[PDB]
Design a protein around this nucleic acid. Structure first.
Ligand SMILES: [Mn+2]
Ligand SMILES: [Mn+2]
Ligand SMILES: [Mn+2]
Ligand SMILES: [Mn+2]
Lengths: 134, 134
DNA sequence: TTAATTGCAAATCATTTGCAATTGC
DNA sequence: GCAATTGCAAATGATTTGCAATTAA
């Protein structure tokens, strides 16, 4: 039983250490959007072998190899998730900072349209919605 | 002698100083979303009687009184004078240029998304990243 | 075998701040 | 004068890195 992230690391050629074994596990099982501090605590939980730097290094390695997506919702720290199958954007509840994920290709179309109407091709974007519940 | 951002500061009731008049002058001149370091380089141009540690306190204070709006783009805080109309940003991954835009449809699809998710939309961030069309 | 990974300081990068000097109003 | 405001320079917090030992292939 290898985590979906672990499998991707193997197929990419990466050396599989004990600490990389767990950090992959952690981020394959994380439903939310943990920060480096939290990915550490969760990894350090499943085995006290890992250090902080290893987690910083490993999460940067993964993001560079398109395994994780980085996020800077604006908390002073960077947050990560396992690269999903299809692109989604993020709805953030300004009351609890819990996160809802949405799609809407209609916006995605309009974005490309807006980029084209300025001389540009769209290489990347970032859409955060902030809202209170009813 | 007087600047638009300096007059907004005299009306708000702040103690006007040589540097704070210069920074108010520099920020009135620019329209390129300059970050703190850049504002420093453009500030000393008018009067070098300013140090780096104050540019922060000024740029932060201005943001407090709502003179400035803050953008933590996808990488160093950049700033601009509080626009009269809301807009998003198209950032050039090819150069320093940054393009301002409004798409009422997007703003409206945003609202529909918050609504159908049982949210009152209280804010949003949008940034598009483009290369010149090849 | 042997090049990549780890762990731990020490070192950044951007921003904040403690405090002695020093303005403004 | 007096409360507010500058200026270093030393703290800051989240991130990176240099280096010697370890470890995966
Ligand atoms: Mn999107
Ligand atoms: Mn997500
Ligand atoms: Mn918008
Ligand atoms: Mn703008």
């Amino acid at each position: 039983m290898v985590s979906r992230i672990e499998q991707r690391c193997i197929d990419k050629g990466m050396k599989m250490t004990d600490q990389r074994r767990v950090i992959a596990q952690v981020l394959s099982d994380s439903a939310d959007h943990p920060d480096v501090e939290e990915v550490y605590r969760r990894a350090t939980a499943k085995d006290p072998r890992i250090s902080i730097a290893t987690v910083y290094r490993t999460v940067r390695l993964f993001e560079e190899e398109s395994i994780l997506e980085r996020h800077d919702f604006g908390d002073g720290r960077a947050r990560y998730e396992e690269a999903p199958s299809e692109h989604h954007d993020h709805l953030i509840d300004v009351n609890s900072a819990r996160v809802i994920e949405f799609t809407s290709p209609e916006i995605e179309a309009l974005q490309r349209e807006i980029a084209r109407k300025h001389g540009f091709r769209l290489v990347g974007h970032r859409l955060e919605l902030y809202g209170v519940p009813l």
